[PDB]
């Protein structure tokens, strides 16, 4: 709250030469006065949806939503993101 106004305030005069922004690519005022109000407050909506789904999966609805003992393509989905896209595997073997 203290730094919202003083340093991002549509042309605050303390930066001076520290940070220079070209005239052409300066889109700040229309980032606040042209907001559709249907997009500015949407990440709160994804946040509350994530809250709902996380609470449901990890507190109550975990009988099937937690462990997936399917046949194929689901264990490998678990491994793909656990091993972070196999970067530590492909990069290692193919370069070092």
| Residue ranges that bind other proteins, judged by CB under 8 A | 1-2, 4-7, 10-24, 26, 28-30, 33-34, 37, 40-41, 76, 80, 85-87, 89-90, 94
> Which lies closer to other proteins via its Cβ, residue 33 or residue 64?
33
The HSE-up count of residue 74 (CA atoms within 13 Å, CB side) is 8
**Cβ 51 vs Cβ 42: under 8 Å:** no
Q: In terms of DSSP H, where are the helices of the chain?
A: 2-7, 42-55, 75-82, 87-95
- Rounded to a whole number of angstroms, the minimum distance from the CB of residue 92 to other proteins is 10
> Which lies closer to other proteins via its Cβ, residue 13 or residue 70?
13
């Amino acid at each position: 709250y203290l730094a919202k106004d003083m340093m991002i305030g549509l042309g605050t005069n303390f930066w001076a030469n520290s940070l220079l922004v070209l005239p052409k690519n300066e889109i700040l005022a229309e980032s606040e006065f042209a907001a559709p109000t249907i997009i500015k407050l949407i990440p709160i909506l994804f946040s509350t949806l994530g809250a709902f789904v996380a609470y449901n999966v990890n507190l109550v609805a975990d009988q099937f939503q937690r462990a997936f003992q399917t046949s194929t393509f689901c264990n490998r989905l678990y491994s793909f993101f656990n091993k972070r896209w196999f970067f530590d595997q492909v990069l290692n073997d193919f370069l070092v």
